[PDB]
Symmetry: D2
């Protein structure tokens, strides 16, 4: 079963970014030339995933709904569900249980930006996996802040620890995950962690203890950025800016990926571009077709 459903966890508190995130959701913040949520959404789209459930806070869910709509304009089927309280990323599978049904589902954090040659290829391997789960390991400078994966001599993943005091490696689990349908039952039975939250890491550990976790390496050639701090938020923006300025191509443009993957055709693009042709984004879409 190809993973055809996905979830974007665009809620949270964003205390690290106050007061910036006091009146503006972290996932609505701009990462250079477009709202942050366009990045994780693009990643799902590039995986061939069109049916997406967007989860956010009670106050912000309607805003992402106003920004994205039902997604038909990009040939997508977007749905929205509120997460009452930020009680853990794993809760996404409890909230989106109905949305998932008996199918497989991907989950990507709303503030995660993925960029790199052959990124679609790497995900497709996970999209096609008949069962189990697929997570990605990425070398970072401060692994303690993330879910760290320990590898043995042969280079095989053996354990996972959420924000360990002493990381057993510098490889963090990224915020993009692909699960089979058994994820829902795991989430429903998960107990609050040591930090009072239902962590996705605990789900990844269950898949691993059952020998069903594939820890796909995401090399240094790829870019995996986070936007939880003032510093990182601006670093990611400069990053994307350098790339787009040089290439004359936008990174993660929903309209462009929709067109290139045939979710919509040229006429639709032209119709969308027209009313926006007055600005650069519109001109970008027109040049594309």
């Amino acid at each position: 079963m190809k993973t055809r459903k996905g979830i974007i966890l665009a809620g949270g508190s964003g205390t690290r970014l106050y007061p910036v995130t006091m009146a503006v959701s972290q996932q609505l913040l701009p990462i250079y030339d477009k709202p942050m949520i366009y990045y994780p959404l693009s990643t799902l789209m590039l995986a061939g995933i069109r049916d997406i459930l967007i989860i956010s806070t009670p106050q912000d869910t309607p805003r992402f709904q106003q920004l994205l709509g039902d997604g038909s304009q990009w040939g997508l089927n977007l749905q929205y569900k509120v997460q009452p309280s930020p009680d853990g990323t794993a809760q996404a599978f409890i909230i989106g249980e109905e949305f998932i049904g008996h199918d497989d589902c991907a989950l990507v954090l709303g503030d995660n930006i993925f960029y790199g040659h052959d990124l679609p290829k790497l995900m497709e391997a996970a999209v096609n996996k008949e069962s189990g789960a697929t997570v990605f390991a990425y070398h970072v400078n401060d692994p303690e802040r993330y879910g760290v994966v320990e590898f043995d001599q042969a280079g095989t993943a053996v354990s996972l620890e959420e924000k360990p005091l002493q990381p057993k490696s510098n490889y963090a689990v990224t915020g993009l995950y692909f699960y089979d349908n058994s994820v829902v039952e795991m989430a429903k039975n998960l107990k609050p962690s040591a930090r009072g939250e239902l962590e996705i890491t605990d789900i990844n550990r269950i898949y691993m203890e059952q020998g069903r976790l594939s820890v796909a390496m995401m090399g240094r050639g790829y870019a995996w950025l986070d936007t939880g701090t003032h510093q990182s938020l601006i670093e990611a923006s400069n990053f994307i800016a350098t790339i787009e300025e040089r290439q004359g191509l936008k990174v993660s443009c929903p309209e462009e990926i929709a067109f290139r993957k045939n979710f919509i055709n040229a006429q639709q693009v032209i119709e969308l571009a027209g009313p926006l042709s007055k600005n650069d984004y519109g001109k970008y879409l027109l040049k594309m077709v």
Copy 2:
């Protein structure tokens, strides 16, 4: 009469930043570690202006309201009014006619960021002017995009042109203006320009024609940035970031300015800083007191 009233024009369509401004108000977009509106707000605070009316769109006006409230926490008196449609910047004085009354009133654009040694001294001079109006002239690289002020050989402001195809100089009129009570009567009788908008420049031309306009020069030693383009918004953030990182001091932090100007006491600061201590912002205010 010392100017004690100010108006922050925080609306507009903001079509140039599309799509970042599709889900979040431009004046709420972050400039490194704080909402864009904190900057022009700080400018008025530094000018001694505490009674401030915030005008935004019908959709966003309530958002600024939820973010800032009546402003009493910073020893300010904030009021809010909606601008049905972006009919023009000069329309701010018609909308705020009741708020202004018979008093003098300053106007600052919600996306204007001012910074430089003696800035307070600069505004102070314009704030104490008995009558007339005061605008500032800043040397910019792209004059065509703003109100341009031409000078005669003696170096005296002789004319003002809104977005001239052939700028008569590289000095633009910034978005910080100090007017006397007569400004209300002018805006009320203003006729829409060729572009169907009530131009603030027209107001300024009227003051000039009446020999009541002081065009204060704002030297290159000062920094004046607006966020018209994605590229400019990110440079604005890098600018503020380098400064703050280096000095270990924040730029345009309302809580700090309210405190250093004795608008509020150390106890009020500690209370407002409590929820914001998850990051440097709140810890900063704590150390400040």
Copy 3:
């Protein structure tokens, strides 16, 4: 024959960066934490090319020499030759005629920075080509500034134009080229272009006309930057900085690449890293081993 020889063209007038290039060679300018030449040098190292000739101006050639020496510390064999005057990039093969001999030879511009997942795999394919030549096509925002490659409806490279007034496409030819021995004979018989310079593009057109040119596409997933302008040089540095900061890994560090490719052992690394431990650079290599 596996391409084992490479030439790094590190000269030129560099008049566009004036005055930064008035006292220091452009290829010695820093890109965040290391000299610009370390990047193209790393590209050749990653392509398996260890015998490298560095061509620069009569003034700078000796400077690269003092910086890198014979390159044996990185398990390389570096040679140096002077380019009297910047008569053209294709002149590299006349100057390096003795160095090349009867072998194949790669050419990379001293100011070219390549980065991306599978980059080594990309070059590997061109390095193992029996005969012919291999260049790469990259989508850029300003094609007019480089050799442009046009494609027919079937998507096949049909022509090459040096700095066309009317680019036939947005794909530029990067400064990394893989040629067979016949390149020497071509450059020797090349006549200066309209701008009085021996164009590398002419060489490439000759390979195309002989049906021996492979135009490999270099996707948007890859990053290709040159330092033609002050603005580009700084974006290049921010790009590398964000990446290194995030991964806790360095981009194009010769010592590291020489080590991971077994060009040198851990003992050689420790020795070269000793003097460089006053900053992250040397400490990095230490932790690496």
Copy 4:
């Protein structure tokens, strides 16, 4: 006696920037669009100082000499003297003793960038002081790395400590200093510090113990940047870039300051611009006149 002599200490080791500073002096590195040394030189020029002694290493002194010449082109009188070994900034007065004679002299570190409205004014006060010394205090985030100044209740400087473990404040002494002629005798008798170097800080302490030190406050409105680390070097570049891009005015352009201060007239500017008009710097100079 108006301070009419100055010294630029453009030597040092720059170990923190290896290998960037292995073949390129730190003061030759680019700070966006021009070599680092243009900044401290500009500061001296803005102080009305034309007779300047440039001190550097034995290998780099001739390079600054090749970049600047005798300075007659900018209406200056530049001299050069080598500092055999980086034995301390205070040694600058031993090396330049002959250059100083019986006159007053300013000293600015070669990697110090000063920017801010009314910066010339602040220096002129020090330039006119009949005797004693003038140093500047600046609020920084990491004072331990600099010479820290302690102030009492009234806000009067009382002590100075070079790189104290526990700074008595967050105010660092900048790298710009103005001394009367007694500085030479102090330097000749200075004993190596606790770190085996003749520190300028010890000279500042002697002036203070004699009640002849003026610690001029340099507020947050000013920008004082250092370029000793990879991070700071790029932060300063982005800073200057944002300013120049917005204003269309260059920060610290020797040719421009020379013209504006009448060291040279328009004809000279035109003659200098002509041969450089092909690049942006030349066009900048032409637009200026």
